[PDB]
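tokens incoming
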């Protein structure tokens, strides 16, 4: 029985196993996906033991993304840019391959929502690892990005890092250009001028509040904004992409998302 897992701390809350099981079912892939608690200190040793004992691959969530990336033998451009990895596959030759499907998951979910038209003007709030993990595929999807963060230096580093891949402007949080943004993405854990939010056409939170509105969506809703989404689809889509890397079959993202949402509600 092929073994996969999600590694994190905490991990008790993870939906990854539920999602991956449905993804396996849908594609009739024979495999099992479990949740693994990564020790804050021993994670590296535990992970390697996990692969030495024969696991085929795994997802990585907080706080080990960076750390997992450093462990890999080979990695994708996506992982390289993110300098972090949410997916590992132990290749047949023994190599540990890192990828980061967070960005393509985000792209895939926005496409489901029809919120990813080429040359959209997109505001992204936050410049932590989450943003860092999605910028490359967003830029590759011809999103013109205005990036703003509480801490300006990090905004500038990211704009500098991704400048070669498309249009991204770093701005101070207190000088976000007042314009209509086709899409605003919250990638904070976390203070945007409400006047900016009010002009926005669509609002996406990478955060997913199991069974409720995230702070960001609640905020948007309090300003009378209605075209909103949390990031549950992003969670399902990144999983589907990880699955595709492992299995060589692309699960039907929309179906599983729908079932999970049905499961969900
Ligand atoms: N109270 C707050 N207000 C604004 N942004 C906040 C916030 N708390 C967390 N964040 C943000 O959330 C991002 C980090 O979120 P996170 O705790 O989920 O980590 P990561 O993005 O690596 O997953 C950072 O952009 C950002 O602030 P700073 O770079 O200035 O630390």
């Amino acid at each position: 029985m092929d073994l996969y897992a999600v590694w994190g701390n905490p991990i008790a809350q993870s939906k990854s196993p539920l999602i991956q099981n449905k993804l396996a079912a849908q594609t009739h892939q024979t495999m099992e996906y479990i949740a693994k608690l990564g020790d804050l200190d021993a994670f590296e040793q535990q992970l390697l033991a996990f692969f030495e004992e024969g696991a085929k691959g795994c997802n990585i969530t907080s706080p080990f993304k960076e750390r997992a990336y450093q462990l890999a033998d080979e990695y994708s451009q996506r992982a390289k840019l993110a300098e972090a990895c949410n997916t590992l596959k132990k290749l047949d030759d023994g190599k540990l391959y890192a990828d980061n499907t967070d960005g393509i998951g985000l792209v895939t979910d926005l496409q489901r929502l029809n919120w990813l038209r080429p040359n959209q003007h997109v505001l992204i709030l936050g410049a932590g690892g989450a943003t860092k993990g999605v910028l490359l595929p967003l830029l590759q999807a011809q999103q013109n990005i205005v990036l703003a963060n509480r801490t300006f230096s990090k905004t500038k580093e990211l704009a500098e890092r991704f400048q070669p891949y498309g249009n991204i402007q770093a701005v101070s949080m207190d000088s976000i250009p007042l314009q209509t943004y086709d899409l605003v993405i919250n990638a904070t854990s976390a203070s945007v001028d409400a006047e900016i939010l009010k002009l926005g056409s669509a609002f996406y939170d990478m955060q997913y509040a199991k069974g409720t509105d995230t702070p960001f969506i609640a905020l948007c809703k309090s300003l009378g904004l209605t075209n909103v989404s949390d990031g549950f689809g992003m969670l399902v889509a990144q999983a589907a992409h990880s699955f595709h890397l492992w299995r060589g079959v692309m699960p039907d993202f929309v179906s599983v998302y729908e079932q999970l949402k049905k499961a969900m509600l």
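note: The chain has two domains: 1-114+231-265, 115-230.
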